[PDB]
Each structure stands twice: as C-alpha cells, then as structure tokens.
C-alpha cells in the first residue's frame, strides 16, 4: 500500500489491525500447505530398499524404480512428468520438503509394497515372493489361485505391454496433466491481476504516490493518499478471500489423495 | 550459514542428520544442544531380505489401543447491528437506514451457522433409538471396563476418562447462545452406545 | 493424565474463536479517518453538516470490519462441518461394526472402538491387533504328488527344513498336509516352483 | 530530471533508440532512465529487503 513512505504508514495506522489478520491468514495457508504435503507423503518410517537382484517372477519394474545414473534418482516416468509441465512486497517461500526427499519417500513406499506385500502397512515388513502375492490378490478379487500359476507368463507379458503403452501415451500426448496446470495458471493470474491493480487512480489525481508527495501540499495529500489506501486495501481483501477459498478446496483434494494412498497402495480395496 | 531460504546467524552447521525439530526449509532445520542446523533425516534405513523362496510368518501378537480426537462443534454466537455500530443513537440509525439490507443478511448467516452447529452435534451423536443399560453384574470374560463405564457415584455420571478430558482442557451487542443438547445428555448417548456395543456386538446397529 | 497438550485441536479451535471475537470487539476504537472514535464527542462538538460526514466514516469502517468477521466465521464453519461429517462417518463405521478399509481407524487390523465425549468433540479409542515375533521359512507354490499339482485351500506351504506343512497366513500353526485341506488342478508340469513331496 | 526514486544504479546494455527517454518492464515500473547531461542508459534496481 505505502511503498516505504512515512506519511502513508501513519495514515494506515489509524485503520485498525487489518494487516495482522491478513498476514496471519497467509501464514496459516503456508503452514497448511506444508502439512498437506507431509501427511500425504510421509506414511512410513523405515526407508526400504530394493534388493540388488531383480527377479520378480518375470515382471519388469525398471520403468518405475529409481535410476542411479541421474543425480535426482528419479524414475523414467517421473522425469517425463517433470519435463511435461512447465519485487513489490510479495515473496515466495520454498517448500520444507525438497523434491529428492519426496522421490525417496515414493521409492521407499514402492519397494515396501513390491517386496513385503501389504504386511508392511500394519506391523513389520515380512518378505513374500511376488508370484505368491499376486496369487493372494487374485484370491482376494474372487478368482482361485490356480489361474495365476497357470498363466503367469501371459499375465507378465501383458503387464509389461500395458506399462510400456502408458509410458508411450504419456510421452507423446502433451495434453495429459491438466489439473496441475490449471491450478498453476489460476495462481499466476491472481498474482498478475493483484499486481496490475496498483496502476489505478481510484479517483485520485495520479496512480503513483511519490509524485503526489513531491508535488502537492500535505493538507489534501491526506485526501489523495486516503483514496489510494482504501482502493488498495479493498483489492487486497478480495485477493485474500479468494486465496482462502482456493486453499480450502486444495486441502479437501489433499485429504482425498491421502485416503487413496492409504487404502489402495497399502492394501487391496 | 547460507541456505536456499536465505542466511542464518547464530547456529553452527553440522554434518550429522537427526529428526526435524524446528523446520526451517529447503530440507534443513535446527535444534538445540548450542543451536545447530542440519539436514533432515527421513528415517531409519533398512533392506528387507527378499528372495524367491523365503517368507516370514509371525508367531506372536500384541493388542494396541490408540486415541483419535475429532472436533464436531463450535460456540454459537450472535451479533446485533444497531447495538454494535450505532450504540443507541437515533441519528446513526437514521443514517444506517438508507444503506440497504446488509444487516438482515448478516443475521441470517449467523442464525444459519448456529442451526448448522446444532444439526452437526445431533447427527454425530444421536445414532441410536433406545438407551441401553449394562446389567449390575459384570463378568465380561475377564475384560475390565471400569475406567470406561460411567460411575454412578459421581454427580456428573461420567467415566474416569471423560472427567480427565473435561478437567484437562481449559458485552457490546454480542451474545452467546447455549447448545441444545446438554453435557449430561451427550454422556447418556455415549453410555447407551457403549453398553449396546459391549453386550449386543454389532447387531444392534 | 500425566502428559498434557494432547488435546491441541479443541483448544486451538476455542482459541481461534476467542481471538476472532476479541479482535472484532477491539476494532471499535479506531478513527477510520474521522476526527474521533467516540460517537457522542463527535455528536456534541459540531453542527450536523459535517457531523454526518464523520458519522458516515465511522459507519462504513465498522461495516467492513463486521463483514470481514462474518466471512471468516463462514469459512471456519464450513471447515468444522467437514470435520463433523468425518467424525459421524467414523462413528457409524468403526463403532457399530468392524471396518475393513485399511488405516481408517487405528494402525493395524482393526477390532473395535469406543467413543468418549469432549467439550466440543469426540475421542475414539481404537483397539487393533499387531503381529510380532516373526520367523523365516522356506516356501513353495504347490505340491507334486502322483504327477498332480496340489494347492492349499486356505493357507501357505512352509518348511522348517524337513517334511513341509500348511499354515494360516497370519499366525504360525503347522499342520500335516492332507487331501482335506488341499485341492488338485491339472498335472504339475507348468507351475514354476513345484516341489516333490 | 524530476523523477524521484530510491534504488541502486547499475550500467545497463539495453539498446534504446534516439527518441526514447526511459523504459519500463511491466506494470508501469520505471526500470531504466537516461541521464540528461551524459545520455547514458542506466538501470534501476530496488534495494534489498525481506
Ligand atoms: C525391462 O524393461 C527395460 C526397458 O523396457 C529393458 O531394458 C531394455 O533392454 C534391452 C536388451 O538389453 C535393450 O535393447 C533396450 O534398449 C533396453 N531398454 C531401455 C529403455 O534401456 C529390460 O531389459 C527389461 N528387463 C528384462 C529382464 O528384460
Ligand atoms: C530371515 O531370513 C534370513 C535369511 O538369510 C536371515 O538372515 C538374514 O539375511 C539377510 C539377507 O542378507 C541379512 O540382511 C540379515 O542380516 C540376516 N539376519 C541376521 C540376523 O544376520 C534372518 O535372520 C531371518 N530373519 C529376519 C528377521 O530377517
Ligand atoms: C507372546 O508375548 C507375550 C507378551 O510378551 C508373552 O507373555 C509373556 O511371557 C513371558 C515368558 O513366559 C512372561 O514372563 C510374561 O509375564 C508374559 N507376559 C504376559 C503379559 O503374559 C508370551 O509368552 C509370548 N508367546 C510366545 C509364544 O512367544
Ligand atoms: C478393573 O480396573 C480397576 C482399576 O481401578 C480396578 O479397581 C482397582 O482394583 C484394585 C484391586 O481390587 C484396588 O486395589 C484399587 O483400589 C481399585 N481402584 C479403584 C479406583 O477402585 C478393578 O478392581 C478392576 N476390576 C477387576 C474385576 O479386576
Ligand atoms: C521341523 O518340525 C518337525 C515337527 O516337530 C520336527 O520333527 C520332530 O522333531 C523332533 C525333534 O528332533 C523329534 O523328536 C520328532 O520325532 C520329530 N517328528 C517326526 C515325525 O519325526 C523336525 O525335527 C523339525 N526340523 C527342524 C530342522 O527344525
Ligand atoms: C529362485 O532363484 C534361484 C537363484 O536366483 C534360482 O536358482 C537357479 O535355478 C536354475 C534352474 O535350475 C539354475 O539353472 C540356476 O543356476 C540357479 N541359480 C543359482 C544362483 O543357483 C531358482 O530357480 C529360483 N526359483 C524359482 C524361480 O522358483
Ligand atoms: C519329482 O519326481 C519325478 C518322478 O519321480 C521326477 O521326474 C523324473 O525326473 C528324472 C530326472 O529328470 C527323469 O529321468 C525321470 O524320467 C522323471 N520321471 C517322471 C515320471 O517324470 C522329478 O525329476 C522329481 N523332481 C525333483 C525336483 O526331484
Ligand atoms: C562437512 O563436510 C564438508 C564436505 O562435504 C566439509 O567441507 C566440512 O568441513 C564438514 N564439516 C562441516 C562442519 O561442515
Ligand atoms: C554539460 O556540461 C558539462 C560541463 O562541461 C559537460 O561535462 C557535459 O558533457 C555537458 N553535457 C551536455 C549534454 O552538454
């Protein structure tokens, strides 16, 4: 509102404690974002590792396991996803968890569910050969475990074909990740209009406060600065309210995602 | 120290890695010994012994009891316009008259909120049709629910745990309205639910 | 009883409500650009023509403050309603019956639950079953006998080194293999892992 | 030249053309000016804060 001006700060002082509330709301939003990430990804304690030898009954997980060649230890699909999608008093704060830590959590979860089955979600991980785990899952859905032990080869073949096909479809068709891009675009547009609103007269004689200070007598400079102050404060309030609504919706989405990871990854629903 | 979040003065960088006490950012945080800043440690490291002809079967078991706290309601409040902004001034009321019907919308919103709170409590707790009562003689196969069942000796008719919980936790035109359901009624619902699930199992649902 | 600060959610909900109400009542003592924050002094100093202007300034400022308070209350009420719906669903599923969705109520295989009241909420006591004291054995997917393949009706084959046994999945309990707890399906020349016995 | 502002002045290589006087980047923020007595393309940068 003021841009480091003593007179503007003094005038804003007599408008009550709006700014403490605004800053509190924004800080709450930031902490809420951090909690969302933490509670959706931090769901295990031990950081499991895949064995050096990979014989998963003929199945091939090379597309999804981390690649030691790259520094980030990200999977092929994770790299494809990352490549697929792209001051005046405002600041951006870095997230608490870095990308490498998130990748490490994902790798730990996947190794745990790929070696011990669903047992690692309740107590301590207990090893089980992968074919036996698949037989258990077929028994769960309502098919006797004879079918898997008699069609293992074909099952593995079409599983590999499907994973390759989804990799190719993701690589080719760029228009695949729409929701994340929409969220980013909405945030960027909100920031753009918020910063563009600073260039309005709001009924005053100029849109820049420095010229008003350096050109005009204080006694009505209070009037002009009051016009500027009320306009900018109203715009800021609107922006804060919109941010609160969007953050609430994002929190609901994060809760759904956490439930899905807990129910479908750690067990068969 | 120089971090992706900025610069830090007053703490000593270390090359260890412990749990995260006071999160700072960019995957690093600080703690007290002196004050030291380090990199977050995601947790312990282990490699499960996978093979293609070896499994692990448990031989014993434990029974665990955990808590889970959930808020269900908040206080019901109401606010009057003319008492708040005007403070019993005729001219203030006359001036406010021409500002349209904002105050009707405000009062409507507050009343809706209060009704919503009452509905929330009622739908959360009133899950039963009859109040069941445990028999005076209690031989539950060796299990002991004394700390959980209500104690008739206390005037409040609350259990030990409920008393612990209740003891532990702590005008200018605005008013606070009492909730529709009193504490004793809520305790009665809880006791009915708990006796029904102890004796009848899940069949009473 | 001993450890405190275990009920942070209810406490800081109460604190949020109290803080909002307190700042709302505090907001009454600001000039908002007028000559004073006390009504009568403005009234009993000036003539009406600008007294009304000052009154208008006070009125509008107090109006935005009240509007902001109401909006914040609405947001908080929506959040609390979502929490209450979750609590009602948990009470319906994990108290009146045994739940199967993993990690919905408690960590481990859920058994049953108890409700307890709170000043503005509920407390669930979840009872769960957690295995321990594991042992490592050699296994196999099927058994060859007379050229036929045998699979367990419900269980898994293990061996402590000799003679093989069938057991249930979640608790060690070996039993001699019999035609009563195993079933046959075809000849054993296609399964990968058959063991002679 | 009557334009008041606080910042740090750095030599800029922006290629003005003989009729402009001062440029800007976005949202009406004077980003570079031309001094009257030397005709030099400077660069305005806000002082550090955070
Ligand atoms: C699992 O899949 C990967 C990739 O689909 C296989 O790696 C391929 O191996 C062949 C033979 O060496 C090469 O010609 C390809 O160029 C490799 N692909 C890539 C992307 O590097 C891997 O062989 C598969 N696993 C098994 C056991 O066959
Ligand atoms: C599980 O079976 C293994 C079979 O080797 C037992 O030995 C462990 O083997 C893994 C694989 O190299 C090692 O990482 C462990 O250190 C071995 N254990 C010990 C105590 O040295 C193992 O004892 C069995 N039980 C458990 C709980 O792992
Ligand atoms: C399963 O675990 C329980 C609990 O640790 C064991 O019960 C204990 O057994 C020891 C030795 O017999 C006694 O000294 C303890 O007093 C027992 N505790 C309780 C609470 O009864 C039990 O022995 C274990 N069973 C197996 C087969 O390992
Ligand atoms: C159920 O647990 C309660 C826990 O308080 C037991 O009550 C205690 O019992 C012991 C042994 O009789 C007494 O020394 C204590 O004074 C009792 N405490 C209280 C607060 O009364 C109760 O006995 C247990 N029930 C059974 C059947 O064992
Ligand atoms: C595996 O378990 C079986 C079942 O108990 C063991 O067989 C018995 O072992 C005891 C101890 O030597 C003998 O006294 C019994 O005569 C055995 N039973 C039979 C029917 O022969 C077997 O020894 C165990 N093997 C290992 C390696 O632990
Ligand atoms: C389990 O894995 C082991 C080793 O990975 C397999 O042992 C191999 O068996 C084949 C079949 O005769 C031999 O040709 C190899 O020489 C063996 N390898 C070693 C290192 O001994 C075993 O077949 C696998 N069992 C399965 C897949 O059921
Ligand atoms: C399980 O038993 C069968 C029959 O006793 C074995 O099959 C024999 O295998 C030998 C060696 O390959 C052949 O010379 C015979 O002609 C086979 N006979 C039949 C009827 O198939 C089989 O090898 C045994 N499996 C194991 C792992 O020992
Ligand atoms: C930590 O390790 C780095 C090398 O990565 C080394 O330069 C440094 O001296 C070590 N100690 C501290 C306190 O940073
Ligand atoms: C202005 O006069 C000074 C004094 O000699 C000289 O150094 C400078 O180059 C002059 N600038 C212009 C634009 O005439």
UniProtKB/Swiss-Prot annotation, chain A:
Region entry Heptad repeat 1, spans: 152-202
Site (Cleavage): 74-75
List of glycosylated residues: 60
Mutagenesis / variant outcome for changing residue 201 to K: In strain: Omicron/BA.1, Omicron/BA.2, Omicron/BA.2.12.1, Omicron/BA.2.75, Omicron/BA.4, Omicron/BA.5, Omicron/BQ.1.1, Omicron/XBB.1.5, Omicron/EG.5.1
Disulfide-bond pairs as recorded: 2-8
Outcome, altering residue 213 to F: In strain: Omicron/BA.1
Chain's role: Precursor of the fusion protein processed in the biosynthesis of the S protein and the formation of virus particle. Mediates fusion of the virion and cellular membranes by functioning as a class I viral fusion protein. Contains two viral fusion peptides that are unmasked after cleavage. The S2/S2' cleavage occurs during virus entry at the cell membrane by host TMPRSS2 or during endocytosis by host CSTL.
Descriptive protein name: Spike protein S2
């Amino acid at each position: 509102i003021c841009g480091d001006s003593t007179e503007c700060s003094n005038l804003l002082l007599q408008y009550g404690s709006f700014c403490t509330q605004l800053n509190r709301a924004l800080t709450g939003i930031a902490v809420e974002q951090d909690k969302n990430t933490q509670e959706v990804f931090a769901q295990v304690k031990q950081i499991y590792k895949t064995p050096p030898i990979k014989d998963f009954g003929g199945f091939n997980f090379s597309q999804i396991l981390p690649d030691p060649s790259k520094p980030s230890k990200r999977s092929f699909i994770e790299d494809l996803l990352f490549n697929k999608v792209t001051f005046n008093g405002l600041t951006v704060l870095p997230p608490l968890l870095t990308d490498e830590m998130i990748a490490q959590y994902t790798s730990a979860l996947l190794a745990g569910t790929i070696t011990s089955g669903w047992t690692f979600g309740a107590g301590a991980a207990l090893q089980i050969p992968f074919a036996m785990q698949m037989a258990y899952r077929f028994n769960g859905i309502g098919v006797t475990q004879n079918v898997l032990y008699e069609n293992q080869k074909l099952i593995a073949n079409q599983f590999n074909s499907a994973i390759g096909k989804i990799q190719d479809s993701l690589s080719s068709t760029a228009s695949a990740l729409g929701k994340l891009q929409d969220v980013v675009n909405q945030n960027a547009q909100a920031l753009n209009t918020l910063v563009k609103q600073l260039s309005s007269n709001f009924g005053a004689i100029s849109s820049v406060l420095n010229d008003i200070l350096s050109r005009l007598d204080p006694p009505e400079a209070e009037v002009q600065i009051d016009r500027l102050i009320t306009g900018r404060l109203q715009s800021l309030q609107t922006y804060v309210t919109q941010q609160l609504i969007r953050a609430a919706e994002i929190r609901a989405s994060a809760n759904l995602a956490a439930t899905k990871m807990s129910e479908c990854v750690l067990g068969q629903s | 120290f120089q971090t992706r979040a900025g610069c830090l003065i007053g703490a000593e960088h270390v090359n260890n890695s412990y749990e995260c006490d006071i999160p700072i950012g960019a995957g690093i945080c600080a703690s007290y010994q002196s004050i030291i800043a380090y990199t977050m440690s995601l947790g312990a490291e282990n490699s499960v012994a996978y093979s293609n002809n070896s499994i692990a079967i448990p031989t014993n078991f434990t029974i665990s009891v955990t808590t889970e706290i959930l808020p269900v309601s908040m206080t019901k409040t109401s606010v009057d316009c003319t008492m708040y902004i005007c403070g019993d001034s005729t001219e203030c009321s006359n001036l406010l008259l021409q500002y349209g019907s904002f105050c009707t919308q405000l009062n409507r919103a507050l009343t809706g909120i209060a009704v919503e709170q009452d509905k929330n409590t009622q739908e959360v707790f009133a899950q039963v049709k009859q109040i069941y009562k445990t028999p005076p003689i209690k031989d539950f196969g060796g299990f002991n629910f004394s700390q959980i069942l209500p104690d008739p000796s206390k005037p409040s008719k609350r259990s030990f745990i409920e008393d612990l919980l209740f003891n532990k936790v702590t005008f200018n035109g605005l008013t606070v309205l009492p909730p529709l359901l009193t504490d004793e009624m809520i305790a009665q619902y809880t006791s009915a639910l708990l006796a029904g699930t102890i004796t009848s199992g899940w069949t009473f649902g | 009883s001993s450890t405190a600060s275990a009920l942070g959610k209810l406490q800081d909900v109460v604190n949020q409500n109290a803080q909002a109400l307190n700042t709302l009542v505090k907001q009454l003592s600001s000039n908002f650009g007028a000559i004073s924050s006390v009504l009568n002094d403005i009234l009993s100093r000036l003539d009406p023509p600008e007294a009304e202007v000052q009154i208008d300034r006070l009125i509008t400022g107090r109006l935005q403050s009240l509007q902001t308070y109401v909006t914040q209350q609405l947001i908080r009420a929506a959040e609390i309603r979502a929490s209450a719906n979750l609590a009602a669903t948990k009470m319906s599923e994990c108290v009146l019956g045994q739940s199967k969705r993993v990690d919905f109520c408690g960590k481990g295989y859920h058994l049953m639950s108890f409700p307890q009241s709170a000043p503005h909420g509920v407390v669930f006591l979840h009872v769960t079953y957690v295995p321990a004291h594991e042992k490592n054995f050699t296994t196999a997917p099927a058994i060859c006998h007379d050229g036929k393949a045998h699979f367990p009706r419900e269980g898994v084959f293990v061996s402590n080194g000799t003679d093989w046994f069938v057991t249930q999945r979640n608790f060690y309990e070996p039993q001699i293999i019999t035609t009563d707890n195993t079933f046959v399906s075809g000849n054993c020349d296609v399964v990968i892992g058959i063991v002679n016995n | 030249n009557g334009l008041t502002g606080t910042g740090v002045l750095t030599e800029s290589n922006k290629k003005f053309l003989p009729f402009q006087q001062f440029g800007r980047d976005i949202a009406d923020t004077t980003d570079a000016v031309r001094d009257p007595q030397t005709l030099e393309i400077l660069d305005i940068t806000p002082c550090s804060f955070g």
